Amino acid sequence: ERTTGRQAQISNITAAKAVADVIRTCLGPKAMLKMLLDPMGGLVLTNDGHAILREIDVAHPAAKSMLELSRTQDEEVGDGTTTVIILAGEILAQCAPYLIEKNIHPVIIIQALKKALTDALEVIKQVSKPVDVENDAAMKKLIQASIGTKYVIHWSEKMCELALDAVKTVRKDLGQTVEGEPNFEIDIKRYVRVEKIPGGDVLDSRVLKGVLLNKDVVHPKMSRHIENPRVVLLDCPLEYKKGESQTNIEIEKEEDWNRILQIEEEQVQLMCEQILAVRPTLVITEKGVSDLAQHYLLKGGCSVLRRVKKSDNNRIARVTGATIVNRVEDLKESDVGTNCGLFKVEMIGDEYFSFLDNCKEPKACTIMLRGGSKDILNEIDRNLQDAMAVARNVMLSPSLSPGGGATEMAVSVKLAEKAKQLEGIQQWPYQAVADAMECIPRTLIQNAGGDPIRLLSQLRAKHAQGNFTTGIDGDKGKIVDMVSYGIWEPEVIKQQSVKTAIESACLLLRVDDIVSGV
Amino acid sequence: LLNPKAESLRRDAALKVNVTSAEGLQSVLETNLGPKGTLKMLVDGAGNIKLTKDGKVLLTEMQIQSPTAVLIARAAAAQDEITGDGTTTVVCLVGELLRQAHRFIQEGVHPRIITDGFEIARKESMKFLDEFKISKTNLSNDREFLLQVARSSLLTKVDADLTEVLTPIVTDAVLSVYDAQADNLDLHMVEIMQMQHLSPKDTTFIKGLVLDHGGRHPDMPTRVKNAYVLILNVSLEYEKTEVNSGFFYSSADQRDKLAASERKFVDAKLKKIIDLKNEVCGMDPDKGFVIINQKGIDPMSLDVFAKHNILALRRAKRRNMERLQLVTGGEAQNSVEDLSPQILGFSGLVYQETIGEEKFTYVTENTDPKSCTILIKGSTHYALAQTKDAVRDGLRAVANVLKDKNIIPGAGAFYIALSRYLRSANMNKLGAKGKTKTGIEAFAEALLVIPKTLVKNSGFDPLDVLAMVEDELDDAQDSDETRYVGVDLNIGDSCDPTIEGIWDSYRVLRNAITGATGIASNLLLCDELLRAGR
Amino acid sequence: QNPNAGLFKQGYNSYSNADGQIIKSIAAIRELHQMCLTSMGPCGRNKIIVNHLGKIIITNDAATMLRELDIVHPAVKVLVMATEQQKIDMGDGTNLVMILAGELLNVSEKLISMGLSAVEIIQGYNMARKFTLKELDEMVVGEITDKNDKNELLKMIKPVISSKKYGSEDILSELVSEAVSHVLPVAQQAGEIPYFNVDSIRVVKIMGGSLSNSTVIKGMVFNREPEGHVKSLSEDKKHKVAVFTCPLDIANTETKGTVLLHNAQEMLDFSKGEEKQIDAMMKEIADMGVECIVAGAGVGELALHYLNRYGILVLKVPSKFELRRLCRVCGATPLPRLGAPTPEELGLVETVKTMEIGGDRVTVFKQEQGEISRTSTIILRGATQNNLDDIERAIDDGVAAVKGLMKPSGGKLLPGAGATEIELISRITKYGERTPGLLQLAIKQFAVAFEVVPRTLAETAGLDVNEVLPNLYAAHNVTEPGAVKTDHLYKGVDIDGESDEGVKDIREENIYDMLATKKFAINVATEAATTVLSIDQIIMAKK
């Protein structure tokens, strides 16, 4: 009903710790397996962090919020599904004694957490190393990490190239003082969906600099290739139109039924002339198009596509610039989608195609995927989605951070060093954040079967006195140089994980009571 | 740190629970391993009792409460869809591997180290399997080896008395369908049938097909020699006027006259059938005539056929007709008017068997039926089920041996040799590190479970038998000679599997080892148990 | 129904680390750690403890509370024995030892939770102890020159009284200094030859008045009625004093010698014998010049009459300790027999008088010119018994501390009010950072354990720790325009109580602590913490 005092904070912290402890062992290649037991007799031994966080039911509202945060991050970012929860839980656990034992008000902790977030971002920027986002070799080598050792290991060589080409096609590298930095405005979910074409091989896959339409010509006597295409989009159908209110057709003589056809012909001719007034080459109508409308449009020297879903037009307006007008009579000359590349309909693998590509940068493209079977196509689609997410993370910031917990250890060391000089009550939460940052290396050591104390102490000493590139080896389990062993993670993932974990910790600390209400 | 309506295992509780469940499952399936094993009794509650020994059937039918045991059983069941045998071997290997892994973990060995050691030992065992197998020849006179394989397969499932009956039956059935040529092997060419009110030892082999439906006239010949098989899809039952008609009368005499008049339609077709019979070997010596007649036959037409020394069946299943199209070579005639000699097939002796509850017909002795039938005979449901399971297992084993020429001697020689080879090579190499020695030793010791379980089931002391086998292997190694040493479950001393006639399939052992290693690795890596969805 | 496995010793109380006993012992010790945390500091508070006799005991001394409290757990017994050792050897710092040991165990609990083996914790604690002991030598700011003057004595006396009786340190320090000055010999700059003893000063209290009415006596004081007709002697110098243990009556043999008057003949004979013997003995004693006779037993009627006849002061001292003090003051030897005024055994007291203090009359034996007494007495006045008891405890603690001003770091002074603690925290933190290996965690925790003293001072004074602690850290961790720290590096922990910002410098109030006391307290606390932590299983046998 109502909770007052430190009890609510203790409950929230315990819920967060319980959520974190479950996935504490989900990090690193040596991640342990977990058993999920349903109320029925079925169970699985899946070790996927996302699956564990999805199939686990939590009653405490804070746990539900943490799970929702992780699920959201699973789509917002390509990695860090389990890292965010672990880091947030460790930070909350470290800050718990200050709120409970030291009688520190939550506001001070929240402010210190925000400052520590800023400091951690600065340290991550400092420790990151640059990468060559323009040389294809470096990008292929980096992206091969998320493609190899998988079902698509056989085609990795071409998978890397396909993913990089798609990302670059949707990537817009621009920098200026007028419009600012667009941040590459990379959108994979909406304008990078993979088209599965049966037959062929992965090496035959190509990236289309535009939108691919599967709608064939609505009439055989229609042009199939335009060297100067222009797209016009409309919604209102080209057919017989009735009144806004109730409409009744009264015919006395049987031969008089042709009056409806004559009226339809007149209206369709007027609408087709209005459409042709803008000098179009391809007419796309979301609603149905009558045969008379197709004939009239063909007489004007343009192609016709009918019953086209809004999903195709949404991307056509992006890659062709055509403006959609609901009413034909309201069509304007400026609505014509000029600057269109081609209307080539060359068939690949006994499938119909319609290419609307160009040499522009509309921040949209289509991936023409080929494969020998449907299962291969689906697996390649999933792997390409993952690889493109990784490539987007890498390219959004031309730098990478060392893996194996080296970044976390360096952040902890630098945060402790800076907190030593703050000279304020807030110093305690900074040290708590620095200690909680050590969760990742502790998990890596535990999963590797090494000494949880001696190895961590040696790593901390190496970071304090040596370089920040030392981390935990996935296989050997010893402290080695990440650069030499090629262990790395994108800087964007680390920054997002730290930011999200600290923000979630602050938000949870803000809630000091749960009350019934509807 | 918990939520309502949920239960979880913390610290090492999950590992202990998984190990206990695996040990329980192993003990459940420990007693039924080898020809000296026992049988399990299953009750469904509806009055049906099944006495089964095959591991796959026992796991599928039996209900399992422990989730870890359910997972182990489901994982081991994959053997049926891949090799058809080794489920019990997989379960025993998983159980012993988990026992050893838990024992080492109690000493502080991390599960990941044990998993890595198991993977290394699995690679070494695959190498040993590759180096240890024997290549089977492609000679068509290998019937003796097929008999040995069938005997080895059957002795595990039967009481050692039905082996003499089933071994030749299985061998012949598998050999007939797969000729001494590349071609291909398909066990669907071997039909399985069951008959009641017969002795278990009556099981026999039929070269061709057996029809369920028999004759319905006392005058039909009991046996027909060199019969021409006729398949007719046209019904020979009483036919009525082709146009609208009826039977309106004051006395039954008019109805009888109308029926006699309408019978001419069937009589005309019967005349054509009899003409065909007479034209084709009508009076030739050592010749006969048999008609299948998928559709029904009027009793008058049956009598007409019988009076002409023609054995005619009726109301046969379409599947039987399709099978006869190949077994006998005859075609199904859609219209009697187009009937011709080319439709007639040919087959050997046609015999009708009379049973108190049914009557069967034999259409065996065909020139090239491209199929065969095995008749399982028994007086009790459990006996019939056991015979059918044993026959299917033998068929699958012989098919695997024929398709895959790689053969490995059994009698426990392979497991002991693999254990010794691992203990030697892995310890001499140390390719990963010393810390993996715990897992290596655990895997090597676990691989010895099968011979120990076999000896325990046979009643002899596993220690003495294993010591004798090891002594013989050491003597062979000191002699610098290649020798296979196994376990004699009847005498108790060591024996040579290549001489006694005990062999194991390469695929069975490979898949069993891989599955056991995978299951052990998956279970040992379970850190905690989570409950959700309630 | 539940099976019991793994138990083979006995059903009696038994604890093992398998169930986390290493933390359970710390939790049990915390029960009295919290009790003692409320005593340290100038703003300490007493507690009410009921004695087995039904009396009420109120005191600010943690050691007294531990003595009056029942100790059961052996882990608590270890700390109790450590506190007893601290009190016996040093005479002060029991609260320091107890609190330091408690905090060391508390941080050891965190170390164990982190997963650090107890062996490494013990090794790190030993290293940190050695480092702190070595560093304390360089933390000395001032030093006592051992001039034996009241002004120099007050410097050490004042801090000792503080935290034992708050608000009265000014008067108690003056009283202690006055009492000490009466017994100290004429010597300076000599720490190798002991001169001052803890028993040289006696503390007594008289009901009535206030502490401002207290005084100091230059000799022995007897608080018992003389029981005679002679109240005081003249001012003539060198009064001969005779000390007796046998009651002043007819002299008899060692065996039997009982006198019983049954009939007229026995009555007359015994009366004549007693009268003649008592008269002769008193005349002989008087002829030698004895003006005062002190007997450890009672005095007979004839003895009283004859003592009045010769004007001999009458006094009875049933307490043998008081007789020993009188003999030390005057040099007289107790006389087991009567009528033996041997000059070699008779003492000399320059002045013997009866003085009235607050309405109560007492007998004082003081020395003026000859046979100067080496003992002094402190008389406390007050209308509240609890305040008088607290003042007596504070005076005893001050007297014990004064004896500690000898050569072995007795005169060395450290900055009190937690400044030394903060400096040690910083130094130990730096050493732990420099120290490689797992010992760094233990060194850092040992440093953190010293943060209690400023925390206790802030809490007992009602100050907000969340502001005082960072202010103290900033004050002791400062950046100056140079390679050598300067300015006010001796800032301590202030109590304020009315209005103030930050903290005050030690030199403003001259709050200093003895180097020897702090060093020995740290050593004992670390030893006790190591002993407690080294126990991972307790096995006992039922009686």
3-state secondary structure of B70: helix
CA distance A50 to C536: 42
**Nearest C-alpha neighbor of C176 from the set C339, C405, C14, C338:** C405
Kindly report the length of chain B: 534
**Nearest C-alpha neighbor of A396 from the set A141, A161, A59, A78:** A78
| DSSP code of residue A151 | G
Report chain C's terminal Cα–Cα distance, integer Å.
28
Contact B370, B179 (CB under 8 A): no
Chains A and C, touching by 3 or more CB pairs within 8 angstroms: yes
At A31, which amino acid appears? A
Sheet hosting strand A399-402, strand order edge to edge: A129-130, A399-402, A488-490
**Nearest C-alpha neighbor of B484 from the set B470, B473, B471, B468:** B473
Q: What sections of A245-329 are H helices per DSSP?
A: 258-276, 291-299, 310-319
A424: closest chain C residue by CA: C470
Structure tokens given for C392? 């007596």
| DSSP code of residue A217 | P
CA distance C38 to C24: 22
Q: What is the largest CA-CA distance in chain A?
A: 102
Sheet hosting strand C347-349, strand order edge to edge: C313-316, C290-295, C239-244, C347-349
Name the experimental technique: cryo-EM
CA distance C169 to C180: 16
Dihedral of CA C11/C17/C18/C19: which sign? positive
At B218, which amino acid appears? P
Q: What sections of C231-350 are H helices per DSSP?
A: 264-287, 301-309, 320-330
Q: Residue B112 is nearest to which of A30, A57, A58, comparing CB atoms? A: A30
H/E stretch holding C201: strand C201-207
Contact A58, A19 (CB under 8 A): yes
Candidates A25, A33, A48, partner chain B, best to mutate (most B CBs within 10 A) = A33
Structure tokens given for C388? 């008088």
For residue A296, the domain's CATH number is 3.50.7.10
CA distance B195 to B62: 27
CA distance C226 to C233: 13
Q: B touches which chains (3+ CB pairs under 8 A)? A: A
Contacts of A242 (CB under 8 A, 6+ apart): none
Count Cβ atoms within 10 A of the Cβ of residue B176 and give its class: 0-12 exposed, 13-18 middle, 19 or more buried. Answer: middle
Q: DSSP letters of A18-65?
A: HHHHHHTT--STTPPEEEEE-SSS-EE----HHHHHHH----SHHHHH
Structure tokens given for A367? 């991936």
At B147, which amino acid appears? L
CA distance B515 to B71: 12
CA distance C488 to B458: 92
Structure tokens given for A338? 């000029």
Distances (CA, A) of A183 to A128, A171, A176, B226: 18, 9, 12, 89
CA distance A262 to C324: 144
Kindly report the length of chain C: 543
With beta carbons under 8 A apart, name residues in chain A contacting B525. Answer: 32-33, 47
Distance from CA of A382 to the nearest CA of C (A): 42
Query: Do the Cβ atoms of B525 and A32 come within 8 Å?
Result: yes
CA distance C229 to B509: 121
Structure tokens given for B110? 């991390």
**Nearest C-alpha neighbor of C40 from the set C103, C82, C85, C89:** C103
Chains B and A, touching by 3 or more CB pairs within 8 angstroms: yes
B111: closest chain A residue by CA: A449
Distance from CA of A37 to the nearest CA of B (A): 5
CA distance C169 to C156: 12
Strand duo A488-490 + A231-234: pairing: unpaired
Count Cβ atoms within 10 A of the Cβ of residue A275 and give its class: 0-12 exposed, 13-18 middle, 19 or more buried. Answer: buried
Helices (H) and strands (E) in chain B, counts: 19, 19
Count Cβ atoms within 10 A of the Cβ of residue C227 and give its class: 0-12 exposed, 13-18 middle, 19 or more buried. Answer: exposed
Structure tokens given for B127? 């190498």
| DSSP code of residue C213 | G
What domains sit in chain C, N to C, each tagged with a CATH number?
A: 1-143+412-543 (1.10.560.10), 144-218+371-411 (3.30.260.10), 219-370 (3.50.7.10)
Strand duo A194-198 + A366-371: pairing: parallel
At B111, which amino acid appears? P
Question: Residue A84 CB: number of other CB atoms within 10 A?
Answer: 26
CA distance A471 to A462: 10
CA distance B277 to B224: 14
Kindly calculate the radius of gyration of chain A based on its CA atoms and give it in whole angstroms: 30
The angle formed by the CA atoms of residues C195, C201 and C202, to the nearest 5 degrees, is 160
With beta carbons under 8 A apart, name residues in chain A contacting C473. Answer: 423, 427
Interface subset of A 352-391, CB within 8 angstroms of B: none
Q: How would you label B207-244 residue by residue, b for 16+ Cβ within 10 Å and e otherwise?
A: bbbbbebbbbbeebbeebebbbbbbbebbbeebeeeee
How many Cα atoms occupy the beta-carbon half-sphere of A82 within 13 Å? 20
CA distance A191 to C195: 97
CA distance A138 to C319: 99
CA distance C329 to C366: 8
Query: Do the Cβ atoms of A14 and B2 come within 8 Å?
Result: no
Distances (CA, A) of C460 to A37, B164, C46, C63, C507: 54, 98, 12, 19, 22
Query: Which resolution in angstroms does this entry have?
Result: 4.6
Extract the runs of DSSP E, i.e. beta strands, from C332-439.
347-349, 351-357, 360-366, 376-382, 413-415
Q: C touches which chains (3+ CB pairs under 8 A)? A: A
Backbone phi, psi, residue A215, to 5°: -85, 120
Contacts of A390 (CB under 8 A, 6+ apart): A78, A79, A143, A145, A146, A490
3-state secondary structure of C206: strand
Directed axis angle between helix B437-446 and helix B111-132, to 10°? 50
CA distance A345 to B220: 73
Contact B436, B117 (CB under 8 A): yes
CA distance B471 to B450: 19
Q: How would you label B318-344 residue by residue, b for 16+ Cβ within 10 Å and e otherwise?
A: eebbebbebbbbbbbbeebeebeeebb
CA distance B305 to B215: 11
Contact C242, C310 (CB under 8 A): no
Kindly calculate the radius of gyration of chain C based on its CA atoms and give it in whole angstroms: 30
Extract the runs of DSSP E, i.e. beta strands, from A48-150.
129-130
Residues of A with CB under 8 A from a CB of C: 102-104, 423-425, 427, 452-454, 457, 461
Structure tokens given for C154? 């007050």
Residue keyed to tokens 């990151």: A128
**Nearest C-alpha neighbor of B207 from the set B330, B371, B361, B345:** B371
Query: Do the Cβ atoms of A457 and C438 come within 8 Å?
Result: yes
H/E stretch holding B230: strand B227-232
Contact C303, C248 (CB under 8 A): yes
CA distance C238 to C505: 52
H/E stretch holding C515: helix C515-533
CA distance B347 to B305: 19
Query: Do the Cβ atoms of A457 and C440 come within 8 Å?
Result: yes
Structure tokens given for A384? 């390409």
Structure tokens given for A351? 């499938």
Q: DSSP letters of B317-344?
A: -HHHHHHHHHHT---EES-GGG--GGG-
Count Cβ atoms within 10 A of the Cβ of residue A445 and give its class: 0-12 exposed, 13-18 middle, 19 or more buried. Answer: buried
Q: How would you label A315-350 residue by residue, b for 16+ Cβ within 10 Å and e otherwise?
A: bbbbbbbbebbeebeebeeebbbeebbbbebeeeee
CA distance B320 to B361: 12
Count Cβ atoms within 10 A of the Cβ of residue A101 and give its class: 0-12 exposed, 13-18 middle, 19 or more buried. Answer: exposed
CA distance C374 to B206: 132
What domains sit in chain B, N to C, each tagged with a CATH number?
A: 1-136+406-534 (1.10.560.10), 137-207+370-405 (3.30.260.10), 208-369 (no CATH)
CA distance A368 to A517: 52
Structure tokens given for C12? 């009696």
At C282, which amino acid appears? M
CA distance B85 to C490: 85
H/E stretch holding B149: helix B143-155
CA distance A29 to A351: 41
A460: closest chain C residue by CA: C437
CA distance B130 to B116: 21
Contact C122, C535 (CB under 8 A): no
**Nearest C-alpha neighbor of C329 from the set C282, C275, C366:** C366
Question: Residue C115 CB: number of other CB atoms within 10 A?
Answer: 11
CA distance A110 to A112: 5
Residue keyed to tokens 């402890």: A21
Structure tokens given for B119? 């993977």
Q: DSSP letters of A350-418?
A: S----B---SS--S--EEEEEESSHHHHHHHHHHHHHHHHHHHHHHTTTEEEETTTHHHHHHHHHHHHH
Contact A466, A52 (CB under 8 A): no
Q: DSSP letters of C134-153?
A: HHHTTT---B------HHHH
Domain that holds residue A215: 210-357
With beta carbons under 8 A apart, name residues in chain C contacting A424. Answer: 470, 474
Q: Residue A55 is nearest to which of B527, B532, B534, comparing CB atoms? A: B532
Q: How would you label A293-305 residue by residue, b for 16+ Cβ within 10 Å and e otherwise?
A: bbbbbbebebbbb
Contact C97, C83 (CB under 8 A): yes
Calculate the CA dihedral of residues A345, A348, A352, A354 and round it to 10 degrees. Answer: -30
CA distance B94 to B109: 18
Backbone phi, psi, residue C378, to 5°: -110, 125
| DSSP code of residue A256 | G
Contacts of B122 (CB under 8 A, 6+ apart): B443, B513, B514, B517
Strand duo A206-208 + A366-371: pairing: antiparallel
Structure tokens given for B422? 């691992």
Count Cβ atoms within 10 A of the Cβ of residue A505 and give its class: 0-12 exposed, 13-18 middle, 19 or more buried. Answer: buried
Dihedral of CA C513/C517/C520/C526: which sign? negative
Candidates C422, C438, C463, C472, partner chain A, best to mutate (most A CBs within 10 A) = C438
Distances (CA, A) of A120 to A91, A96, A117, A502: 13, 20, 5, 10
How many Cα atoms occupy the beta-carbon half-sphere of B441 within 13 Å? 10
Q: Residue A56 is nearest to which of B71, B526, B530, comparing CB atoms? A: B530
Contacts of C488 (CB under 8 A, 6+ apart): C475, C505
Contact C504, A142 (CB under 8 A): no
Query: Do the Cβ atoms of B527 and A25 come within 8 Å?
Result: yes
Query: Do the Cβ atoms of A457 and C474 come within 8 Å?
Result: no
